[PDB]
């Protein structure tokens, strides 16, 4: 078996985000539980990526996972320079370069699940004004923002959407103040797509009580605020990391040198309802799932950047 092997994991910021980074740790710990492999987990930061990952290498890791686009260039450099080490990255963002054979990149079509979140929030909102709180801007987050705004307009052409960015995935207090300002300005539902920062958005909703709703992200976040999180736009990082790593442990060769793309139809993303609010939002949830099937069948082409969004809006 694979018991002698080691799989390592490096994230940016804290593991304990109730979402994206946490899901990567869940996968690695489940691999340890099921296969009895060795694991190493490291929470890192930009000023020390190079040293932290060089250390996972020196621990003779058989596979090193990096999580999130902020690790893109470092994971690429280390893979390029260490041909005998295998690396995989969740959401590497690369422009010019060709991916080396010992690096596997995973890309999620986040705009697809964000479209479901926007459609849902737009149908559910009583004020007709909804919010989006993002983490760090860039290609990944813009896919969430434009997918959300497009799905919202698809549900109601005159929907009002307020978008703000915390600017980091690790500022809970700024998530809270951003959300508090939105709720005070007539927003009644906020999609928090902001890592740990978004948990502060949830805190703001809890502090304001009933009628301040959240669309959660990455994992089912209804348990964080069972009266306020209506639905969650999940990203199935843990399932994918487990299955890809298990295959790698069986073959010993990384299926790398490429980017694997996952959206709704690959079961890489999904929309998960809070059962405590079922009687009240089930009809909208079911309509949202039909929208998801239209996306999966290629009927709705979901925008993901400014150009595709502006075209989508003009062609509605
Ligand atoms: N530490 C992080 N680093 C990079 N991207 C992140 C991080 N946390 C969250 N994200 C991204 O923001 C989205 C919403 O939390 C996630 O699905 C992921 O794409
Ligand atoms: Cl605070
Ligand atoms: Na804080």
Numbering used by the authors: 8 to 323
Q: Could you share sentences copied from the article?
A:
In conclusion, BmpD is a nucleoside-binding protein of an ABC transporter family that plays a role in the purine salvage pathway of B. burgdorferi. Located in the periplasmic space, BmpD enables B. burgdorferi to acquire purine nucleosides from the host environment. In bacteria, ABC transporters play a vital role in the import of nutrients and require a substrate-binding protein (SBP) to deliver the substrate to the translocation channel formed by the two permeases. B. burgdorferi lacks the essential enzymes for de novo synthesis of nucleic acids and acquires purines through the purine salvage pathway.
The final crystal structure of BmpD was refined to 1.43 Å. The structure is a monomer and consists of two domains connected by a linker region, characteristic of the SBPs. The N-terminal domain consists of residues 8 to 115 and 243 to 269, and the C-terminal domain consists of residues 116 to 242 and 270 to 323. In BmpD, the central beta sheet of both domains contains six beta strands and the N-terminal domain has four alpha helices, whereas the C-terminal domain has six. The crystal structure also unexpectedly contained an endogenously bound ligand, which had not been added during the crystallization setup. The ligand was bound in the cleft between the two domains, and the electron density indicated that the ligand was a purine nucleoside, which was confirmed to be an adenosine by liquid chromatography-mass spectrometry (LC-MS) analysis. Furthermore, the aromatic rings of the purine base form stacking interactions with two phenylalanines. Compared to PnrA, BmpD has a more extensive water-mediated hydrogen-bonding network connecting the purine base of the nucleoside with Asp19 and Asn28. The main differences between the adenosine-binding sites in BmpD and PnrA are found in the loops flanking the binding site. Asp27 in loop 2 of PnrA points toward the ligand and makes a hydrogen bond with the backbone nitrogen of Phe87, whereas Asp19 in BmpD is turned away from the binding site and forms ionic interactions with Arg77.
